[PDB]
Amino acid sequence: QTIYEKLGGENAMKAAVPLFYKKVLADERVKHFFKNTDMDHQTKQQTDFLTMLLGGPNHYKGKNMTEAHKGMNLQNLHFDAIIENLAATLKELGVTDAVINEAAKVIEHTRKDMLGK
Numbered sequence: 001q002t003i004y005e006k007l008g009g010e011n012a013m014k015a016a017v018p019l020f021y022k023k024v025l026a027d028e029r030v031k032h033f034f035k036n037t038d039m040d041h042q043t044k045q046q047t048d049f050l051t052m053l054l055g056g057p058n059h060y061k062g063k064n065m066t067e068a069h070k071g072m073n074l075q076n077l078h079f080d081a082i083i084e085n086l087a088a089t090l091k092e093l094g095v096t097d098a099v100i101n102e103a104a105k106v107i108e109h110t111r112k113d114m115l116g117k
């Protein structure tokens with residue numbers, strides 16, 4: 001049983017990523033980072049990336065987390081905002097606190113790869 005299956009699999013991930021961007025794009029701490037970003041592309045990469053990270057099929061062909069955020073000099077508060085919006089998304093979609101916490105614990109290992117790059 002992977003975290004991806006516990007979340008609801010493909011149809012749940014396809015609903016979660018756009019809801020997560022609706023929340024990120026309303027969040028003052030982070031929305032502006034995406035001003036010049038093709039959000040269709042980004043939704044597809046982030047769907048593939050979280051699907052792979054959370055134990056679903058691995059079709060992620062994008063950049064690593066350092067290259068993805070290179071030049072942005074991201075700060076801790078920006079990563080906390082992302083995790084908070086993803087947790088709020090999964091909660092709103094009906095995922096239990098225990099599964100959200102498992103997912104956040106995997107994603108949290110990426111923090112050192114993207115901050116201050």
Ligand code: HEM
Pocket residue numbers: 030033034036037038042045046049061062063064068069074078079080082083107110114
């Ligand atoms: C720390 C706060 C973060 C901010 C502000 C942020 C912002 C961004 C932005 C603006 C881009 C696209 C740059 C462009 O248009 O080329 C991007 C790329 C990406 N980000 Fe983040 N990100 C953050 C954290 C995360 C986290 C926690 C993850 C996954 C755990 C993630 C996964 C990705 C992925 C998969 C890409 C696509 C890379 C590709 O296109 O090859 N980011 N990020």
